[PDB]
């Protein structure tokens, strides 16, 4: 894919729409997440056009997937990242000086700094972007004022140059927000509020995921296929209120209602729908019809066609006919079926071109039941065994892959290690006896230890290892998600410790499901030392720096690093990862 840009050219026509971005770099992001945009042309601030044309980001589509380039001054061209394979990010940390971004201004307040204004935009349930007037701002009553804004689209309706001010977006899409997510879904309930948009969705999960990435959706109501009125089945309704909560909860039957999860965006699948919808046909415009042996094959053909947004496979019906079906690659103006017909024999789903906009640690992992305690390859693919070469190479502790180049582990693990260079990170491991001198391993380039760290019992017990070579993900090696700051009040109830017991090591990996126990309950058992909010306990066979991983809503979260346990009775103590999200992110980008 043509990843970088194209000063100073311009595509000819094919326009879907026109939006305003503070930059081509961002224009290219809007183009990526737009469901039809394949390419675009941005217009930078320049002598060549009136102010009213600056910052114009024009999204475009072409059937051949490209357009006629033409030379033009202060135009910038590019392609969407849909075609690309590596991760795709909405996050934009840019502050833009002397730029003022227009929208519905809903809050005026005073703020220390552009930074602390950003913190406020990010922490607010409505905020798309802000403008902050600096203390050098001519008008004495406007100095230090943090103005909070939103629009229909999430992008400003207008951009203007204005001395002595700075704008920027909500860092909700880097996992920076403190706003709590409401994961609770209310069955048989409709909401009433400003309906800001609407789509057809095969179920209330797709409905909720769409609500989440729709800039102006705070909550939603979904009308199931069993809804009385024919005209509104599978209608997914995208709502908002000024309160921001739904004013009212009306009872009913065969609707379902819930909230945007935009706050918990990483750590939840959003842009990725990998389910198949049986005896379901998704209406849209047809892009192709091809032969294929299965839906899985259909989905792949869709996924590999960049204009494709969803498909329907009609198989060899019943069990009779050649096992060759028809794959209808379809598309719409908004990435959804215009209509969802049940009972016509088709099998339907969506493109996976979408799926790399999601955090890698949100893929499913292929299960089994029931126990216990024998683990196997594939099972805990974030678990690493962290080796020391001296005195002689041996398991020093456990850790967890959280990044392409990152391990999260316990600080206390590196008591008297003078140098990164004595460390070996091995992934994919089960048996310890499987590691040999020929075994492949990652070198650690660096060790970051919470600076306020001292005694494990004192807390701050957290380390990042930056690996020397990145990890190529696989069924054996995959990151695990950090909890979301907006999940603070969540109640995990499927928790597991993994490791080799390090003290006297064990050969194969151990797995033990255990239960969190409240801080109070812990505080009561650990007489002497305090137990800060920055810890978390469990109990009722993992090693140091090892993961306390909890499964919630189909995704694994790294809830705790093991730090000081007297347990397997008495509870173990752990670093409370959620409390160090800011820190990890700062340290890692």
């Amino acid at each position: 894919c043509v990843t970088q840009l194209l000063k100073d050219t311009c595509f000819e026509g094919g326009d879907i729409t026109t939006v305003f971005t503070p930059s081509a770099k961002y224009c290219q992001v809007v183009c990526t997440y737009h469901p039809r945009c394949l390419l675009f042309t941005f217009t930078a601030e320049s002598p060549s056009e009136d102010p009213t044309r600056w910052f114009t980001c024009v999204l475009k589509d072409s059937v051949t997937e490209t357009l006629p380039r033409v030379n033009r001054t202060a135009a910038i061209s590019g392609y969407s990242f849909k075609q690309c394979s590596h991760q795709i990010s909405a996050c934009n940390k840019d502050i833009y000086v002397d730029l003022d971004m227009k929208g519905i201004n809903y809050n005026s307040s005073v703020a220390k700094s552009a930074q602390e204004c950003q913190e406020r935009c990010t922490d607010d349930v409505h905020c798309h972007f802000f403008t902050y007037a600096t203390r050098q701002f001519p008008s004495l009553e406007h100095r230090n004022i943090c103005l909070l804004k939103h629009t229909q689209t999430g992008t400003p309706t207008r951009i203007t140059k204005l001395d002595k001010v700075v704008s920027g977006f909500s860092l909700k899409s880097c996992a920076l927000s403190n706003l709590a997510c409401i994961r609770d879904i209310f069955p048989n309930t409709v909401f009433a509020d400003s309906n800001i948009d609407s789509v057809m969705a095969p179920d209330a999960f797709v409905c909720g995921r769409i609500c989440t990435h729709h800039p102006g959706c705070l909550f939603f109501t979904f009308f199931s296929q069993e809804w009385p009125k024919e005209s509104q089945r599978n209608l997914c309704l995208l709502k908002t209120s000024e309160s921001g909560l739904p004013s009212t909860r009306i009872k009913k039957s065969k609707a379902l209602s819930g909230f945007s999860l935009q706050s918990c965006r990483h750590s939840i699948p959003v842009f990725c729908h990998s389910s198949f919808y049986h005896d379901t046909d998704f209406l849209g415009e047809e892009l192709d019809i091809v032969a294929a042996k299965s839906h899985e094959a259909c989905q792949k053909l869709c996924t590999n066609a960049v204009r494709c947004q969803f498909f329907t496979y009609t198989p060899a019906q019943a069990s009779c006919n050649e096992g060759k079906g028809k794959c209808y690659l379809k598309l719409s103006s908004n990435g959804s079926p215009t209509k969802i017909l049940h009972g016509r024999g088709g099998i339907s789903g969506y493109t996976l071109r979408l799926c790399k906009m999601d955090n890698e640690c949100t893929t499913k992992i292929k299960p089994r039941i029931v126990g216990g305690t024998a683990s196997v390859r594939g099972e805990w693919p974030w678990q690493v065994t962290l080796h020391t070469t001296s005195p002689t190479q041996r398991h020093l502790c456990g850790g967890s892959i959280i990044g392409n180049q990152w391990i999260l582990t316990a600080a206390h693990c590196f008591y008297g290690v003078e140098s990164p260079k004595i460390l070996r990170v091995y992934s994919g491991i089960l048996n310890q006896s499987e590691i040999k001198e020929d075994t492949s391993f990652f070198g650690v380039q660096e060790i970051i230890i919470h600076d306020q760290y001292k005694m494990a019992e004192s807390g701050y017990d957290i380390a990042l290892l930056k690996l020397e070579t990145t990890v190529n993900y696989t069924d054996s090696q995959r990151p695990i998600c950090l909890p979301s700051k907006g999940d603070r009040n969540v109640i995990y109830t499927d928790c597991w410790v993994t490791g080799w017991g390090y003290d006297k090591i064990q050969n194969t990996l151990q797995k033990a499901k255990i239960p969190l126990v409240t801080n109070e309950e812990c505080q009561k058992r650990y007489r002497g030392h305090k137990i800060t909010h920055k810890m978390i306990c469990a109990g009722y066979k993992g090693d140091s720096g090892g993961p306390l991983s909890c499964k919630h809503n189909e995704v694994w979260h790294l809830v705790g690093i093991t730090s000081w346990g007297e347990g397997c009775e008495r509870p173990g103590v752990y670093t409370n990862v959620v409390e160090y999200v800011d820190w990890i992110l700062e340290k890692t980008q």
Partner: peptide, 9 residues
């Protein structure tokens, strides 16, 4: 409340 913009001066 809806607030007005910042001054152009």
């Amino acid at each position: 409340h809806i607030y007005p913009d910042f001054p152009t001066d």
